[PDB]
Enzyme design. Structure first.
Site, PDB file in Angstrom:
ATOM      1  N   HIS A  27       0.768  -1.241   0.000  1.00  0.00           N
ATOM      2  CA  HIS A  27       0.000   0.000   0.000  1.00  0.00           C
ATOM      3  C   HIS A  27       0.805   1.301   0.000  1.00  0.00           C
ATOM      4  O   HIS A  27       0.222   2.384   0.040  1.00  0.00           O
ATOM      5  CB  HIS A  27      -0.953   0.008   1.199  1.00  0.00           C
TER       6      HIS A  27
ATOM      7  N   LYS B 138      -9.133  13.468   4.435  1.00  0.00           N
ATOM      8  CA  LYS B 138      -8.274  12.294   4.452  1.00  0.00           C
ATOM      9  C   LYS B 138      -7.323  12.515   5.624  1.00  0.00           C
ATOM     10  O   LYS B 138      -7.230  13.630   6.141  1.00  0.00           O
ATOM     11  CB  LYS B 138      -7.477  12.206   3.148  1.00  0.00           C
ATOM     12  N   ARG B 139      -6.615  11.472   6.045  1.00  0.00           N
ATOM     13  CA  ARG B 139      -5.689  11.618   7.163  1.00  0.00           C
ATOM     14  C   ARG B 139      -4.651  12.702   6.846  1.00  0.00           C
ATOM     15  O   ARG B 139      -4.284  12.907   5.685  1.00  0.00           O
ATOM     16  CB  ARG B 139      -4.994  10.277   7.463  1.00  0.00           C
TER      17      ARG B 139
ATOM     18  N   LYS C  38       0.302  14.098   1.459  1.00  0.00           N
ATOM     19  CA  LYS C  38      -1.025  14.396   0.915  1.00  0.00           C
ATOM     20  C   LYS C  38      -1.153  15.896   0.639  1.00  0.00           C
ATOM     21  O   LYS C  38      -2.105  16.353   0.008  1.00  0.00           O
ATOM     22  CB  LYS C  38      -2.127  13.921   1.874  1.00  0.00           C
TER      23      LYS C  38
ATOM     24  N   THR D 186      -8.588   6.288  -2.374  1.00  0.00           N
ATOM     25  CA  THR D 186      -9.916   5.712  -2.594  1.00  0.00           C
ATOM     26  C   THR D 186     -10.955   6.798  -2.374  1.00  0.00           C
ATOM     27  O   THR D 186     -12.052   6.751  -2.935  1.00  0.00           O
ATOM     28  CB  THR D 186     -10.216   4.512  -1.662  1.00  0.00           C
TER      29      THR D 186
ATOM     30  N   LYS E  74     -14.702   7.937  -4.359  1.00  0.00           N
ATOM     31  CA  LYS E  74     -15.963   8.263  -3.700  1.00  0.00           C
ATOM     32  C   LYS E  74     -16.529   9.599  -4.204  1.00  0.00           C
ATOM     33  O   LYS E  74     -17.733   9.722  -4.453  1.00  0.00           O
ATOM     34  CB  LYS E  74     -15.754   8.327  -2.186  1.00  0.00           C
TER      35      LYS E  74
HETATM   36  N1  LIG Z   1       1.504   0.697  10.387  1.00  0.00           N
HETATM   37  C1  LIG Z   1       0.578   1.193   9.460  1.00  0.00           C
HETATM   38  C2  LIG Z   1      -0.779   1.307   9.833  1.00  0.00           C
HETATM   39  C3  LIG Z   1      -1.722   1.796   8.910  1.00  0.00           C
HETATM   40  C4  LIG Z   1      -1.329   2.189   7.593  1.00  0.00           C
HETATM   41  C5  LIG Z   1      -2.385   2.683   6.614  1.00  0.00           C
HETATM   42  O1  LIG Z   1      -3.518   2.852   7.049  1.00  0.00           O
HETATM   43  N2  LIG Z   1      -2.090   2.893   5.351  1.00  0.00           N
HETATM   44  C6  LIG Z   1      -2.975   3.254   4.437  1.00  0.00           C
HETATM   45  O2  LIG Z   1      -4.184   3.390   4.674  1.00  0.00           O
HETATM   46  N3  LIG Z   1      -2.517   3.486   3.249  1.00  0.00           N
HETATM   47  C7  LIG Z   1      -3.428   3.853   2.174  1.00  0.00           C
HETATM   48  O3  LIG Z   1      -4.182   2.636   1.741  1.00  0.00           O
HETATM   49  C8  LIG Z   1      -5.127   2.871   0.667  1.00  0.00           C
HETATM   50  C9  LIG Z   1      -5.864   1.534   0.319  1.00  0.00           C
HETATM   51  O4  LIG Z   1      -5.041   0.716  -0.567  1.00  0.00           O
HETATM   52  C10 LIG Z   1      -4.396   3.435  -0.572  1.00  0.00           C
HETATM   53  O5  LIG Z   1      -5.368   3.688  -1.600  1.00  0.00           O
HETATM   54  C11 LIG Z   1      -3.617   4.708  -0.189  1.00  0.00           C
HETATM   55  O6  LIG Z   1      -2.893   5.210  -1.324  1.00  0.00           O
HETATM   56  C12 LIG Z   1      -2.613   4.317   0.947  1.00  0.00           C
HETATM   57  O7  LIG Z   1      -1.864   5.468   1.346  1.00  0.00           O
HETATM   58  C13 LIG Z   1       0.043   2.079   7.212  1.00  0.00           C
HETATM   59  C14 LIG Z   1       0.999   1.583   8.149  1.00  0.00           C
HETATM   60  C1  LIG Z   2     -12.263   6.527   1.884  1.00  0.00           C
HETATM   61  C2  LIG Z   2     -11.698   6.963   3.310  1.00  0.00           C
HETATM   62  C3  LIG Z   2     -10.331   7.219   3.503  1.00  0.00           C
HETATM   63  C4  LIG Z   2      -9.289   7.165   2.356  1.00  0.00           C
HETATM   64  O1  LIG Z   2      -9.190   8.447   1.767  1.00  0.00           O
HETATM   65  P1  LIG Z   2      -7.975   8.874   0.762  1.00  0.00           P
HETATM   66  O2  LIG Z   2      -8.245  10.266   0.406  1.00  0.00           O
HETATM   67  O3  LIG Z   2      -7.811   7.869  -0.302  1.00  0.00           O
HETATM   68  O4  LIG Z   2      -6.731   8.889   1.696  1.00  0.00           O
HETATM   69  C5  LIG Z   2      -9.891   7.650   4.706  1.00  0.00           C
HETATM   70  N1  LIG Z   2     -10.758   7.839   5.731  1.00  0.00           N
HETATM   71  C6  LIG Z   2     -12.077   7.587   5.595  1.00  0.00           C
HETATM   72  C7  LIG Z   2     -12.968   7.706   6.835  1.00  0.00           C
HETATM   73  C8  LIG Z   2     -12.572   7.156   4.378  1.00  0.00           C
HETATM   74  O5  LIG Z   2     -13.931   6.947   4.232  1.00  0.00           O
END
Ligand SMILES: Nc1ccc(C(=O)NC(=O)N[C@@H]2O[C@H](CO)[C@@H](O)[C@H](O)[C@H]2O)cc1
Ligand SMILES: *Cc1c(COP(=O)(O)O)cnc(C)c1O
Ligand SMILES: Nc1ccc(C(=O)NC(=O)N[C@@H]2O[C@H](CO)[C@@H](O)[C@H](O)[C@H]2O)cc1
Ligand SMILES: O=c1[nH]cnc2c1ncn2[C@@H]1O[C@H](COP(=O)(O)O)[C@@H](O)[C@H]1O
Ligand SMILES: O=c1[nH]cnc2c1ncn2[C@@H]1O[C@H](COP(=O)(O)O)[C@@H](O)[C@H]1O
Ligand SMILES: *Cc1c(COP(=O)(O)O)cnc(C)c1O
Lengths: 807, 807
Positions: free
Chosen positions: B348, B539-540, B545, B647, B651
């Site tokens: 990821h 987003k986070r 970002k 993602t 949405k």
């Molecule tokens: N130790 C950790 C704990 C949590 C994470 C984490 O939440 N990472 C992500 O959510 N990464 C996100 O996962 C999405 C789903 O494939 C991608 O679309 C996005 O580009 C990526 O940054 C990464 C490392």
């Molecule tokens: C879809 C979703 C994400 C992922 O958003 P990105 O902009 O792809 O980082 C994060 N948090 C919530 C609550 C979501 O619904």
């Protein structure tokens, strides 16, 4: 089917079955092909619970509308045991459920054995609270039981190598179908902080907050459609490194984690103090909330009664004062009047090491405001004493709520007496001892406060539920009314010469013994002779209860047999069971001694099946329901003046066992009710004990004058019962010989002689049974319904009611 | 009522109502006169859950009978959000429940807002797992989601004084009606201990045991009567001073206490490692148990597929080897073959600080046997590399699973590639980058292993559930089939010139905006202009970002207005929301900057309602369902090459928002599907970024050449946005000027220009909407049903099915 178990109507059985299948499917999310006995147990439990709901909701709705005086029973222990069968009995659903499960191809007894005991108590005090709840519901009182929902109750006892091993009692693992969480009623409890003295009153600030979440459990009355509530609080941390902060929530939630199992020696542990305030603080806010919904607190005592089960919840007194004074703004004198008229205290022991004496430095840090209130209470109280007994400076120090010395402590018993309008002992002799010794000064100052309320047990669980066979033969002759009016058992005296009845009483006992003998082999792989006399002593292990005296008799019997092997002796199966508090060394050594004796006696070819010694593992409420109905002889041999009352003694009497015991606690009233000729009384009376203390107790004297006793002590010392470890029991011998506070040796001779008379009577089946009938027939006074009716009329100021509710 | 919400039959509504009242009475033990909105929510929840049961039981029974290949999705995160509405949608019960509650005098939307989000995830990775479960059920796959039941999910975010404050997410406080505890299926998990090497194989002994208790949650497919399972493990201590021993149970149970919220920087914390093994060990035993009930493990890969969501559950590889070798006694080579064919890994991110590299000393103490297995795996793998590339010693060190240096570490990504038959990126550009950079060596060794599986989102929750208005107007014209076959949205292109449709699309968006604008005032007391362009970035918070780039644009707009106050500008409401990991300093400073900008901009009289800056507090799944349907512009501006896929971008596209973004992650395929003319693309491509790194990034250059940019930096430095604390943002300015890994300044000019083009189009309502239609019409490829169908066919080796089940 047996009568006292209700009717098994066609459409009632049909309804139970469909609801049983409904729960198995929708509630347990299961299907018949993969369901296990546990799943079936839960399906039945949820089915029976459904029947409680309607009654529970309208009973509480009824109290809201009628607004009667409310009774609050505060206790840190509620030894409930299992709930399924008790619920069916009180709802008259037992035969219907038995039939319904039968038609589904299931055995209800098997399912009942799956339920975990709710062991939120240590012994007598906790079980008394449980019987009281049952009687208060049966007598239609608007009563609420308030306590703590321990995640872990009394530990499960395992015997390894003859030693007690403690195991966590994770009773909530599979869930509790009887409770209903009420998170919406969560209340804040404060700890630590500091007291600010502003212009208008004191203020308790900078406190740490812990949330109290209530869980309600229904308490059904006996077939009167009344369902009261037992509300138990659970500790929760408020939501306001990151990871560590979250993990540290456990600190706050540890308050309701486990029940303290020390019922012998008071330990001033901070966690225990937190538990005590926690239950008191959450409960009182709940009480006040309900009152304000019935601002003139003058009527508070007319609508509220708070009963303190021992001093454990004694902080209710200064907490009520804190709320009325600091929050409601009443003046001290008025608040005090309300507090005294509201609270009542029950004492359960005169033994000094059990009395709560909290170090001032602990209250100072944890509850700063309460300590100030306690000091003020003490000051005003002592001013009253000084005025009543001018110049008696010694009385002043004796009655003070504050004890001086190494470390200053607060005597919670003194606090309870000063702040209660009633103080009671739990047996006539106990209440008298309170007035003559321990609380003599208080009695002279306020004689009107002291009362007696002899303990009792509920005939539902302790007769109908655990001994249906006996309940049935009794009903066949005098009806079912005795179940909620136990005094009616007296009518049984007119059947003492009835050959049929005598035969039935003896048959039931024999069936109970075979049933228990079988259980012993199934779940414990031990074989016993069902035709022997079942000599039983079950209760927590304590030096004052003298399981050791019982041990000396057992060894004596063994030595006599070895002396004259071909001489006839009445066969006996001696059963001793009970848990020892984790840090009570001597109690643990006594358990080891019992098993060690069994190891020798049970494997001696010459003894054969004439004598067997068995230690009943993990004694608890559910086990008591099995062994008590199967007993022939009940051992109640505490040193005169030490057992406040005892309740196990009442259970045995109601179930057809004869009693061998001292004139202690309730034993005195039991013998008085049945007639001394129908009791096996022996040993020193309280007067004899005192006189012996004046003179000075010298155990050596008995050792030198009684050959049989000398032989036993030498066997213990030489390692006869511990070959690999010759001095294993040196601590026991040393205690018995040099510092036995309970005078085991002093009652040995009379005890052994009395036991011979027991064996003589057992040899005459007909006369033994007739004596049994005379005991059962006169056990009516010991029903907790009588006890509760007295508390209601003489302490709480409310009238009990046998009137049924609607549907 | 709207069509896509199902029929509201007379007897269906009648049935729901009676069951609703039944649960309120029997389940909640409540009566209409004291029930609160929360009580009503639970009554409805239990009512809807009942409808799931029958289907759930037969779906699982069906798999037992058919015995199809089983898919196991292992993840430490499942960001589920709320379950009530999603369940009604998939069961076609929404209109019926809406009517039923209406007739009971209740508003269903109000009740839905009471449900707590199941926030067991951080963001994208966790939400992807959630969408995948929904699609796997909808496609009839025998899939199981396996993870951890955290007592506390992602923290609730509070903004105090403009700063983020974390609050425990006690989501289970009021109970979870959707889960079913399965204590009877508890399994043992081992930790610590030592390895013994006997005659016949290695042995892991002297371990500490922690029990894994499963909780099952139903996952309904979209109207196909399929209900799969998500099994989450909870940690429990075995039952075997006394008080302290009991209290120390918490140590073991802390494993499932809380979700680690650090999604930016890998922390080698022991507790996290324990969580990772815990889920893996319990899951694999469950998998093997189910297999043995379908000893020839050769068919194991034909009946089992294990998908690893990132490296978090990578220990599944050495754990599977441990079980097959140590317990089942297979020879290494055979066990390895089975393991590789069974496991598949999904990456990821390419950012180095996020990659898991566990210190050897940690695995050495916690999982001694696994470390030995990992070393052996590495040895055999490197022998293969050495044989394929003789003499290339550098490649050997680069590909090793063991990293040398200060402290030896295990590269879990390398472990996953070696032990998996498939490795995939989550967007075309990301998968390519994996092969060209980070995993180049592995790709050259085993090219067949590398695949791409572009992410997707489920159209049920992300369209039908959160945007019924849009789903309805679409259905009116092309039917309902698109809900489970999103590619059908392409038929909407023939309506791009339809005056009616254009009007309806624009009406729905306007209604969503008014709805959200109202919500902002109700639950947050903030007023916004519904006629302004809703510019949203949720987003986070991460530097990659680039929420900071967005901030620079906002300040630029503000400065331009102050420059020429009476000049017309398209009104905008800029909304930025997202949580920052607790220990991520820069992310927290960025949140503060956002609120600080709002404090200035939102209170400037000259600006009026032409520009508003709002920080959306506590962004989570339920909030996303509200703001996304109301957005006009979607900000997807990560530095090219940093966002693996994204993602949230999908949405927004599905819900009628236009997108301004870089050619990063899935943005590339989105623009490709809709046509670049219908996207607002700007900035450096990955190639431009590299070339800039070759040369060397010098932020000063942009500062010297762009006046507007210089002014913003000076305002930040001088304290224009922080009067009381002039140097409050010195860390931000210093990072931007001297060590910005993400080149914020390099894309500033093109970004600002692109934003002007966005405003120009917004001024033409008709053309803006036509472009929107072209985006929605081409968003079909981004349905997780397509993603899952590809995983099924190209990785797991199973065929998806749209065939309904029975009833
Ligand atoms: N130790 C950790 C704990 C949590 C994470 C984490 O939440 N990472 C992500 O959510 N990464 C996100 O996962 C999405 C789903 O494939 C991608 O679309 C996005 O580009 C990526 O940054 C990464 C490392
Ligand atoms: C879809 C979703 C994400 C992922 O958003 P990105 O902009 O792809 O980082 C994060 N948090 C919530 C609550 C979501 O619904
Ligand atoms: N700190 C503690 C904790 C528990 C106890 C405790 O359980 N005490 C008792 O059970 N005492 C017992 O309570 C019975 C009910 O009134 C009496 O009949 C019996 O005589 C008495 O010893 C005592 C002190
Ligand atoms: O304000 C009220 N209106 C109507 N019924 C009430 C109200 N307060 C309590 N009740 C009823 O009284 C019962 C007692 O609740 P308690 O406060 O837990 O004692 C409740 O379950 C209701 O049936
Ligand atoms: O031994 C068995 N007999 C009959 N049904 C079974 C048996 N084992 C599993 N099942 C069915 O298969 C479902 C799957 O259970 P699992 O082991 O959790 O996957 C169970 O709920 C039962 O319906
Ligand atoms: C009745 C009971 C007690 C009290 O017994 P005594 O002999 O009065 O001490 C203790 N434990 C259990 C489980 C009981 O049922």
């Amino acid at each position: 089917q047996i009568s006292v178990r209700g009717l098994a109507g066609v459409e009632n059985v049909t309804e139970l079955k469909k609801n049983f299948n409904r729960h198995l499917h929708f509630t347990l999310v299961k299907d018949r092909n993969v369901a296990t006995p546990r799943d079936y147990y839960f399906a039945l439990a949820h089915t029976v619970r459904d029947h409680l709901v309607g009654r529970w909701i309208r009973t509480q709705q009824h109290y809201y509308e009628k607004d009667p005086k409310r009774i609050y029973y505060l206790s840190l222990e509620f030894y409930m045991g299992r709930t399924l069968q008790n619920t069916m009995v009180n709802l008259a659903l037992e035969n219907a459920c038995d039939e319904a499960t039968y038609q589904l191809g299931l055995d209800m007894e098997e399912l009942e054995e799956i339920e975990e005991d709710a062991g939120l108590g240590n012994g007598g005090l906790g079980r008394l609270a449980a019987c009281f709840l049952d009687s208060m519901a049966t007598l239609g009182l608007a009563a609420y039981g308030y306590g703590i929902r321990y995640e872990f109750g009394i530990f499960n006892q395992k015997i390894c190598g003859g030693w007690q091993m403690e195991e966590a009692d994770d009773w909530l693992r599979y869930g509790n179908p009887w409770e209903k969480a009420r998170p919406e009623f969560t209340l804040p409890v404060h700890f630590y902080g500091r007291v600010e003295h502003t212009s208008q009153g004191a203020k308790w600030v900078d406190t740490q907050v812990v949330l109290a979440m209530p869980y309600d459990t229904p308490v059904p009355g006996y077939r009167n459609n009344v369902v009261n509530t037992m509300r138990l609080w659970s500790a929760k941390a408020p939501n306001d490194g990151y990871i560590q902060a979250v993990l540290d929530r456990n600190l706050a939630e540890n308050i309701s984690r486990v029940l303290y199992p020390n019922d012998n020696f008071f330990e001033g542990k901070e966690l225990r103090l937190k538990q005590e305030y926690f239950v008191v603080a959450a409960t009182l806010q709940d009480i006040i909330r309900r009152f304000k919904s019935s601002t003139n607190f003058d009527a508070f005592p007319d609508k509220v009664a708070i009963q303190l089960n021992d001093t454990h919840p004694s902080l209710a007194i200064p907490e009520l004062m804190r709320v009325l004074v600091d929050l409601e703004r009443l003046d001290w004198d008025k608040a005090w009047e309300v507090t005294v008229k509201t609270c009542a205290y029950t004492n359960h022991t005169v033994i000094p090491e059990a009395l709560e004496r909290w170090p001032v430095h602990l209250l100072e840090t944890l509850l700063p405001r309460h300590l100030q209130i306690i000091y003020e209470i003490n000051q005003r109280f002592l001013n009253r004493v000084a005025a009543a007994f001018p110049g008696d400076v010694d009385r002043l120090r004796r009655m003070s709520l504050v004890e001086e010395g190494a470390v200053k402590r607060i005597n919670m018993a003194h606090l309870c007496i000063a702040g209660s309008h009633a103080v009671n002992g739990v047996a006539r002799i106990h209440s008298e001892i309170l007035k003559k010794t321990i609380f003599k000064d208080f009695y002279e100052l306020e004689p009107h406060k002291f009362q007696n309320k002899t303990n009792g047990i509920t005939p539902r669980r302790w007769l109908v539920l655990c001994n249906p066979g006996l309940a049935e033969i009794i009903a066949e002759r005098i009806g079912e009314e005795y179940i909620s009016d136990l005094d009616q058992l007296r009518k049984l005296l007119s059947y003492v010469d009835d050959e049929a009845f005598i035969r039935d009483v003896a048959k039931v006992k024999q069936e109970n013994k075979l049933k228990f003998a079988a259980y012993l082999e199934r779940e414990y792989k031990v074989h016993i002779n069902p035709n022997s006399l079942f000599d039983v002593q079950v209760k927590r292990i304590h030096e004052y209860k003298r399981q050791l005296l019982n041990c000396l008799h057992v060894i004596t019997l063994y030595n006599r047999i070895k002396k004259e092997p071909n001489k006839f002796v009445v066969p006996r199966t001696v059963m001793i069971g009970g848990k020892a508090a984790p840090g009570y060394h001597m109690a643990k050594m006594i358990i080891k001694l019992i098993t060690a004796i069994g190891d020798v006696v049970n494997h001696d070819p010459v003894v054969g099946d004439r004598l067997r010694v068995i230690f009943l593992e993990n004694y608890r409420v559910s086990l008591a329901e099995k062994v008590i109905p199967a007993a022939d002889l009940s051992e109640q041999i505490s040193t005169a003046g030490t057992e406040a009352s005892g309740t196990g003694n009442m259970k045995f009497m109601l179930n057809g066992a004869l009693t061998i015991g001292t004139m202690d606690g309730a034993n005195v009233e039991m013998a008085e009710e049945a007639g001394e000729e129908n009791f096996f009384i022996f040993g020193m009376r309280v007067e004899d004990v005192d006189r012996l203390d004046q003179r000075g107790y010298n155990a050596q004297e008995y050792y030198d004058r009684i050959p049989e006793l000398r032989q036993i002590i030498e066997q213990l010392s030489s390692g006869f019962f511990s070959p690999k470890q010759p001095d294993l029991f040196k601590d026991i011998v040393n205690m018995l010989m040099h510092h036995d506070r309970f005078k085991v040796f002093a009652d040995y001779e009379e005890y052994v002689k009395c036991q011979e008379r027991v064996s003589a009577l057992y040899k005459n089946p007909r006369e033994w049974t007739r004596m049994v009938i005379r005991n059962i027939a006169t056990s009516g006074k010991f029903s907790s319904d009588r006890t509760i009716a007295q508390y209601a009329r003489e302490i709480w100021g409310v009238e009990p009611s046998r009137q049924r509710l609607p549907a």
